[PDB]
């Protein structure tokens, strides 16, 4: 039966747009989370380089190069997180485009089905005029 199906398809679309909104929000969390890390991380590299400068000021070359190892380790981690960020932004624009398209698709799918239903219903109503007129009075009333 038509109305049941056509409305059901539209109902499904309302779920879908919310699901992809979650995924967008999730992606916003990924960017936020990586920003939070990368921002601090890059400062941590400085902090340990500063600790190295304390050894430069006087004293331990061992501490100084140890502190370089911290700086390096952090630097390397920040490159990994910079890479991870590219995956987030690419996936984000993927969701964004998928959504924007899906929303247009949903919108017109619903609207076309509705106006089709309306014109189909109107068409059968006009046909029902012709049928009911075909229910002519040229009948067994004559026989009576």
């Amino acid at each position: 039966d038509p109305e049941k199906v056509l409305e059901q398809a539209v109902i499904d679309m309302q779920e879908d747009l919310v699901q992809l909104r979650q995924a967008v929000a999730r992606t916003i969390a990924e960017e936020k989370r990586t920003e939070q890390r990368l921002n601090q991380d890059t400062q941590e590299a400085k902090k340990w380089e500063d600790r190295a400068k304390l050894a430069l000021t006087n004293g331990e070359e061992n501490l100084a190069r140890e502190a370089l190892a911290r700086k390096k380790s952090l630097t390397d981690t920040a490159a990994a997180y910079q890479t991870q960020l590219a995956q987030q932004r690419t996936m984000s624009e993927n969701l964004r485009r998928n959504l924007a398209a899906l929303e247009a698709k949903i919108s017109e799918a619903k609207t076309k089905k509705n106006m089709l239903q309306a014109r189909a219903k109107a068409a059968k109503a006009n046909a029902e005029l012709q049928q009911t007129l075909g229910g002519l009075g040229t009948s067994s009333a004559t026989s009576a």
């Binding site: 999730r26 969390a29 936020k32």
Partner: protein, 48 residues
């Protein structure tokens, strides 16, 4: 202090979600505000 900071960072993650939401395609709505700002500046040019 860390546990509750892990929730601070969750609010920062909520701020990634706020930014991840933040673009809407409605930014064009600013444009006539800017144009009409120019209009009130033409009224300043009328004043002098």
């Amino acid at each position: 202090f860390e546990r509750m900071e892990n929730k601070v960072l969750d609010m920062e993650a909520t701020s990634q979600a706020a930014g991840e939401l933040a673009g809407f395609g409605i930014e064009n709505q600013f444009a006539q505000l800017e144009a009409s700002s120019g209009v009130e500046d033409e009224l300043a040019a009328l004043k002098a």
